[PDB]
Amino acid sequence: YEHTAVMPNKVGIPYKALVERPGYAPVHLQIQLVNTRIIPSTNLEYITCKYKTKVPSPVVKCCGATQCTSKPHPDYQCQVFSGVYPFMYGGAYCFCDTENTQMSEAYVERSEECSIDHAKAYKVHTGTVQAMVNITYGSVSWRSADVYVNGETPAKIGDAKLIIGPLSSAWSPFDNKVVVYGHEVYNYDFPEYGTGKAGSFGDLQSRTSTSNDLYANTNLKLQRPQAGIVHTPFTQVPSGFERWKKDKGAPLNDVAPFGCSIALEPLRAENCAVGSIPISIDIPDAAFTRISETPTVSDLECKITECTYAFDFGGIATVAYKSSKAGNCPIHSPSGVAVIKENDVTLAESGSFTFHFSTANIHPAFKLQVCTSAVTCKGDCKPPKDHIVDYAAQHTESFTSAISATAWSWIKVLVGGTSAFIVLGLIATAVVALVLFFHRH
Amino acid sequence: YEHTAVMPNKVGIPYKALVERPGYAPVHLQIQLVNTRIIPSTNLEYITC
Ligand SMILES: *[C@@H]1O[C@H](CO)[C@@H](O)[C@H](O)[C@H]1NC(C)=O
């Protein structure tokens, strides 16, 4: 039997319902999400890391001159400094005082740290949404499986065929561009490959961490060597990767809405409490029992003995009953007013049973379904003591949940007073108009 | 669970109350004063004899 419904996209809060099959006693169904994962499709754009400046030995040409040539090296620089007179431990290196030339070379390459300390720039698009579900039905204990939240791929869980519909919202915490550094994800609009600027995040860009083609854009300028010293001085803008690491700011892990948790393998947002999830589960036929084969429950009376509209199961109720065959009986509240903790109870020939529930309503009024029967529970609830709790609420608050009987009385008095007073004016007008008409006639 | 109340300043007369904690059965509480002492601060001015 196929049961179709919509459950909220809340991890850790179970969805409870009764599977009502004509001719068979209702079968209690419970579906709980273990986790929800939004797995976008990612494409690695390039890898950024701190640059290393490689400086080959300068060519010191005594009594002559040399000329620089271009080379296929990232940010390659070459400048010929004429009129050098270098000295070393062995004295004057060259004889000629002026016809003396030093050729300096420098180029940028990936630092050794780039193998471990680097940022990955990813292009992010929409993708698969997956979830893990925990399901029970009838006497069958908990079963779980990983399913695709797409509304097309069925999953076999405990011989039950479950279809999970697409999320009601396409919202995702990742922008079209993300930067993955370590365990953190940043919604950073990184510059495109080949357009990075010196001192900024993209100053050094590589398609892969092992790529032989490196793009480097730093103001690498060769400076004239100091008088008499053989060295290759240079000026360069500080690495933009270190600057970004200082200014990277708050990662998406800390600012993602809806409490999403960000994971990197694969990149995904977990447990985002967004929208609702349509579902469809086919309960095995063997799980259903005929009405005449189940105990019949009658003479139901529900008394709420305690109630607090706390996030936990702060309510307690006692249900008196009479039943035949003294068997087990599913318990469920189809109304959203209160969520019942117990799923089923053991019934005797006569007696009473208790159950716990959580509700936000100051005056709960909900229908409790007892296998083949139903009863209405009413009561009053006190405010909770704890201002702050470390656990999510088990119930859903409604617009009218906070309206007390006193507030309803005042609302009825105000609305009825104004309505009746206006109606009085209208009736008086019609009556006097008719009186004038009969004055003429 | 904190229970707050006002008891009379009487010695030998116990204060009785039920500590009602939401969701738990009430716990009987009995507070009795054995003695009360007002101990002012004193400065010896002088000794006469
Ligand atoms: C399903 O819920 C039951 C509750 O007793 C728990 O023992 C089980 O571990 C849950 N399933 C998963 C996959 O965590």
From Swiss-Prot, chain A:
It is a single-pass type I membrane protein. The chain crosses the membrane at residues 418-438. Disulfide bonds join 49-114, 62-94, 63-96, 68-78, 260-272, 302-377, 307-381. Residues 84-101 are annotated as: E1 fusion peptide loop. Class II viral fusion protein. Fusion activity is inactive as long as E1 is bound to E2 in mature virion. After virus attachment to target cell via host VLDLR or LRP8/APOER2 and endocytosis, acidification of the endosome induces dissociation of E1/E2 heterodimer and concomitant trimerization of the E1 subunits. This E1 trimer is fusion active, and promotes release of viral nucleocapsid in cytoplasm after endosome and viral membrane fusion. Efficient fusion requires the presence of cholesterol and sphingolipid in the target membrane. This is Spike glycoprotein E1. N-glycosylated. Glycans are attached at residues 134, 271. The precursor of protein E3/E2 and E1 form a heterodimer shortly after synthesis. Processing of the precursor of protein E3/E2 into E2 and E3 results in a heterodimer of the spike glycoproteins E2 and E1. Spike at virion surface are constituted of three E2-E1 heterodimers. After target cell attachment and endocytosis, E1 change conformation to form homotrimers. E2-E1 heterodimers interact with host VLDLR or LRP8/APOER2 to mediate viral entry. Interacts with 6K protein. It is found in: Virion membrane; Host cell membrane. Residues 1-417 are extracellular. Residues 439-441 are cytoplasmic. It comes from Eastern equine encephalitis virus (EEEV).
